[PDB]
Amino acid sequence: DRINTVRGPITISEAGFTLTHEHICGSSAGFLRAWPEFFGSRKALAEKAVRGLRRARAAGVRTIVDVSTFDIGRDVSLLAEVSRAADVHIVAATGLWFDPPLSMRLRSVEELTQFFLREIQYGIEDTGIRAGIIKVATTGKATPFQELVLKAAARASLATGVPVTTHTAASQRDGEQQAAIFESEGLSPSRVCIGHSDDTDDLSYLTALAARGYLIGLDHIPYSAIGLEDNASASALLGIRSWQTRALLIKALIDQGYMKQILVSNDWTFGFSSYVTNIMDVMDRVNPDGMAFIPLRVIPFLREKGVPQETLAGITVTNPARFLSPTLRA
Amino acid sequence: DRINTVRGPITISEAGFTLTHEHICGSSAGFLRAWPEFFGSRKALAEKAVRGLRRARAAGVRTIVDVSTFDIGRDVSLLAEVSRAADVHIVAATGLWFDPPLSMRLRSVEELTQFFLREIQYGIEDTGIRAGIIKVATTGKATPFQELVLKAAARASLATGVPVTTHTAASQRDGEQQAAIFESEGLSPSRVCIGHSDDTDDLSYLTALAARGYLIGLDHIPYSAIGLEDNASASALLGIRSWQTRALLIKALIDQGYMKQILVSNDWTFGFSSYVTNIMDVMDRVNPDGMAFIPLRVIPFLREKGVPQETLAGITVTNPARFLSPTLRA
Ligand SMILES: [Zn+2]
Ligand SMILES: [Zn+2]
Ligand SMILES: [Zn+2]
Ligand SMILES: [Zn+2]
């Protein structure tokens, strides 16, 4: 039915062009509140986010999905502030990424399910803001704790119709184990996006997941260290495959008939504290378009390669709404 | 001539009987605000803390030092609320414990120094509440990041006069490496408490540190799994030595001539989320007196063993004031 955003529930008709894997700020729980000067100031960070969201809106974006979890330092009051100021819908997330503190990593699968349900059904912190997606992660074979998180996320999705989206080490085919765990919980693949999937060139892996009904998150398109290859930290984060190579995976999935299974995004952010201090600046140097990279650079690139505009509208408008609108089977 | 508390500056005389290593809630950054129902509710936690602090005050306690850092989930607004309701002074902490998130673990020594200084000189979050102690931790030989933390803590102490207090694995003699690192930064031992030191029976380790001018934190006195040795999680936390064994270390150091170097506490808490779910209840079963254990049980026990009350007042009143009152050399 309706999709919860930080300003309240919206209808499918209202979502419009949606970026399905983004961030306002990539941090850690408590960090923005304890050390705002890391970001210059809270005001500076908010201003930067508003400018970038307005940039994206001007390029046609209407909704982003902020897949920052508790342990990414999600601050839903910041999300609400910038959503209002930029007039861009923002869907907030629950789940856990790969920096859970002791108070999360000691919890059982039932306890984690309760937490994710709280954030979806009741609200985040004392804000009343309800999550519209559940984010989870692996980096290779799931750790024991990550298996509990995947199972809890599946259970929370099965109780609410709120989809699950993942971080993968795509080149290691993590999506297969994630899918196997999800299906062992009875979760429908139509409620799951296997993200960071443009990090691999293995089209067989991607098409096989798409044929099983998964959504394939091609969310790293602007990530490339070309021109800065001997920046070790940037190379590790961004890789050295070109944005064009990544974008051509969108075309390849289209050409093999899987347009309904594709979700595209930038995995952008406006603040970034969980890595090297000035990674945000390096990223902004790599992709000055920020969140507008998909509409301004990727869509025209794919048009030039012969992809019809109606296909691209299906990917960027129709697929996200079908993914986000709550259901147990889409 | 003043010590910062969660209710503002206090004089040395106002501090009175002081417990130097305690917690209101042992958690993780952001956790109490995101999942208060873990604790029943925030109201239930606060009520529990006020009841316990009122009982400690009735037993003679006037101040506690809450050594919860950012990564212990310190919520200075909760400390301020319970301090007011119970009429007990609470000193808040900066520093980092052994569960830092990525946004902390990626920082340099200079950045950490700036963060600890912000918390001491400016305030914690947006609250205006300034830290009066710096807490650090090792569990065996320091990791590279923990070396940075210790160095940053020494630098912040050298710039402000606020003392440093530590978590150790006393069985591993961590106090010796901590001392070595601190002295390599020029920090006076008179500004350092080596905590959890009652976790060892190795008197020579303790006396050698005391002879160098360190404060010796005998802060685990009520910790014992005697009667519940088959509870593996409680035994790992609490050990299998009796409270009387731990308390007799106080006497041993007095007898050697080191009464000036002793600090005593309970390392108690009113909420605990960073371990097994119901550890708080197990702890309360072990020590129903909570923070009042030191004045109600340990002081009379040491008097029965022949220690003058005046020596015990020196330990519980005079030594904490000398430790906390800012200086570069006490
Ligand atoms: Zn990711
Ligand atoms: Zn991301
Ligand atoms: Zn400790
Ligand atoms: Zn402690």
DSSP notation for A277-298: TTHHHHHHHH-TTGGGHIIIII
B 115-174: CB under 8 A from A: 115, 118-119, 124-126
Helices (H), chain B: 12-15, 31-34, 42-58, 76-86, 102-105, 109-121, 144-160, 174-184, 203-211, 232-238, 243-256, 279-286, 293, 299-304, 309-313, 319-324
* Cβ atoms of residues A161 and A191 within 8 Å: yes
Calculate how far, in angstroms, residue B196's C-alpha sits from the geometric centre of ligand 3.
7
Using the Cα atoms of residue B197, residue B202, residue B207 and residue B213 in order, give the sign of their dihedral. negative
d(CA B9, CA B6): 8
Q: Residue B73 is nearest to which of A31, A103, A114, comparing CB atoms?
A: A103
Residue among B147, B155, B168 at smallest CA distance from B215: B168
d(CA B267, CA A143): 32
Look at strands A3-5 and A8-10 and give their pairing.
Answer: antiparallel
Q: In what order do the strands lie in the sheet with A18-22?
A: A18-22, A63-66, A89-91
- Residue B178, phi then psi, degrees to nearest 5: -60, -50
Q: Of A75, A102, A116, A280, which to mutate for an interface test with B (greatest number of B Cβ within 10 Å)? A: A102
Residue among A305, A180, A319 at smallest CA distance from A249: A305
Residue among B128, B159, B113 at smallest CA distance from B326: B159
* Cβ atoms of residues A93 and A66 within 8 Å: yes
* Cβ atoms of residues A188 and A215 within 8 Å: no
Residue among B182, B177, B92 at smallest CA distance from B138: B177
Q: CB distance A101–B34 less than 8 Å?
A: no
Neighbours of A253 (CB within 10 A): 23
The residues, any chain, with a CB within 8 Å of residue A87's CB and separated by 6 or more, are: A57
The residues, any chain, with a CB within 8 Å of residue B168's CB and separated by 6 or more, are: B137, B138, B174, B175, B178, B194, B195, B196, B197, B199
Q: Residue A115 is nearest to which of B35, B102, B115, comparing CB atoms?
A: B35
Residue A5: what residue type? T
Lookup: tokens for B199: 């976790």
Residue among B305, B197, B174, B306 at smallest CA distance from B261: B197
B 235-294: CB under 8 A from A: 273-277
The residues, any chain, with a CB within 8 Å of residue B157's CB and separated by 6 or more, are: B134, B163, B164, B187, B191
CB contacts of A33 in chain B (<8 Å) are: 125-126
Residue among A140, A153, A141 at smallest CA distance from A191: A153
Lookup: tokens for B231: 């509870």
- Residue A94, phi then psi, degrees to nearest 5: -110, -165
Q: What stretches of chain A adopt beta strand conformation (E)?
A: 3-5, 8-10, 18-22, 25-26, 63-66, 89-91, 93-95, 133-137, 164-167, 192-194, 215-218, 262-264, 271-272
3-state helix, strand, coil in chain A (%, to 5): 50, 15, 35
What's the 3-state SS for B42-55? Answer: HHHHHHHHHHHHHH
Q: Residue B103 is nearest to which of A73, A111, A126, comparing CB atoms?
A: A73
Q: Annotated binding residue at A23?
A: yes
DSSP designation for B142: P
Residue B285: what residue type? R
Q: How far B80 CA lies from chain A's nearest CA (Å)?
A: 17
CATH of the domain at B215: 3.20.20.140
* Cβ atoms of residues B321 and B20 within 8 Å: no
- Residue B39, phi then psi, degrees to nearest 5: -95, 15
Query: What end-to-end distance do the CA atoms of chain A give, in Å?
Result: 11
Q: Annotated binding residue at B267?
A: yes
Among residues B66, B198, B267, B284, the one annotated as catalytic is B267
d(CA A92, CA B199): 45
Q: What is the resolution of this structure in A?
A: 1.0
**Residue A282's Cα: distance from chain center in Å?**
20
- Residue B242, phi then psi, degrees to nearest 5: -75, 160
Lookup: tokens for A277: 């201090």
What's the 3-state SS for A87-146? Answer: CCEEECEEECCCCCCHHHHCCCHHHHHHHHHHHHHHCCCCCCCCCCEEEEECCCCCCHHH
Q: Residue B275 is nearest to which of A106, A114, A125, comparing CB atoms?
A: A106
Neighbours of B116 (CB within 10 A): 28
d(CA A173, CA A56): 31
- Residue A97, phi then psi, degrees to nearest 5: -100, -160
The widest CA-to-CA distance across chain B, in whole angstroms, is 51
The residues, any chain, with a CB within 8 Å of residue B189's CB and separated by 6 or more, are: B179, B182, B183, B212, B213, B214, B215
Q: Of A23, A25, A27, A28, which to mutate for an interface test with B (greatest number of B Cβ within 10 Å)? A: A28
* Cβ atoms of residues A289 and A19 within 8 Å: no
Full domain range(s) for residue B254: 1-330
Q: Of B23, B28, B76, which to mutate for an interface test with A (greatest number of A Cβ within 10 Å)? A: B28
The residues, any chain, with a CB within 8 Å of residue B91's CB and separated by 6 or more, are: B3, B4, B5, B6, B63, B64, B65, B66, B131, B132, B133, B324
d(CA A97, CA A71): 6
Q: CB distance A106–B277 less than 8 Å?
A: yes
Residue among A13, A19, A60 at smallest CA distance from A309: A60
- Side-chain half-sphere exposure of A263, counting CA atoms within 13 A: 30
Q: A33 and chain B: CB distance < 8 Å anywhere?
A: yes
What's the structural domain count of chain B? 1
